Amino acid sequence: NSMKNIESLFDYSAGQFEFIDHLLTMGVGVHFAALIFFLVVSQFVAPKYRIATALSCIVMVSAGLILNSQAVMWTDAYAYVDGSYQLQDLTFSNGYRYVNWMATIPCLLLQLLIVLNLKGKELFSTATWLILAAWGMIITGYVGQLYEVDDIAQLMIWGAVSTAFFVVMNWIVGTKIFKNRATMLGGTDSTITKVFWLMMFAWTLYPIAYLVPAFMNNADGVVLRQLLFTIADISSKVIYGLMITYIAIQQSAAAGYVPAQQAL
């Protein structure tokens, strides 16, 4: 897991290494700060959409803990020796991001289906296919990055299979969105279309980070990847769940929930 990542191949200057450390530690604070926000606003959401904000809190801590885990792992693996930080232990890898995405993604998808006003049969059915599509995407992608050092061709093939799931997954998402936005209240039929494009953008940054070993195999590619992961995390989880929350509140107010109508 550790020796399989391009991180293990390079020494890092002080500036590259502190900069990565600060991207992770910052990612933690952003998520734990948003957790408090999502927490305080749960009271202004009608019982119908209130699980959607709870799922945001679950994401913020799930990501926060894996990011904080990367941060520490980052500093335990390297030591400043002779003017550069040099690998000292086999503790750091991006594999724990992948096993994290197995959890956060179903939560990010569920809160979408919730604000879309699905329920019962369709909610359980659409939920099942998306998580299996997402899990297929994640698993094929995890196996592929195990070769980002040894067999790039393999990374390309698994990346290809992973993208097949990704494409099927977004097609289902978009289909349910455009077929059910006429149901949403307070004018959120316009917001949800924006959230979808936000999904398409932020999520597409991930495969771009996945391919960094293929076009930038050096220490500055290790920095660019984390920088890309940071931008994707902040957009796919924080900004994403902020608009999920806005949508939830808006419809709560439009549906006659008083705490929502007074919050707004």
Ligand SMILES: CCCCCCCC/C=C\CCCCCCCC(=O)OC[C@H](O)CO
């Ligand atoms: C190795 C790469 C293999 C993959 C090659 C890519 C080919 C497919 C391209 C884009 C699909 C995008 C799907 C997501 C777009 C959402 C569109 C949508 O939501 O569905 C339309 C809806 O039915 C309207 O009513």
Ligand SMILES: *C/C=C(C)/C=C/C=C(C)/C=C/C1=C(C)CCCC1(C)C
């Ligand atoms: C908060 C984290 C999120 C929403 C992670 C999303 C991850 C992806 C959309 C990953 C997609 C990949 C492919 C489409 C092919 C290459 C391998 C992956 C797993 C990086």
Ligand SMILES: CCCCCCCC/C=C\CCCCCCCC(=O)O
């Ligand atoms: C393949 C693994 C299974 C994945 C499917 C997970 C199913 C998720 C289904 C819906 C969970 C959200 C329930 C929220 C309903 C709100 C209604 C209420 O609580 O009164």
Ligand SMILES: [Cl-]
């Ligand atoms: Cl995550």
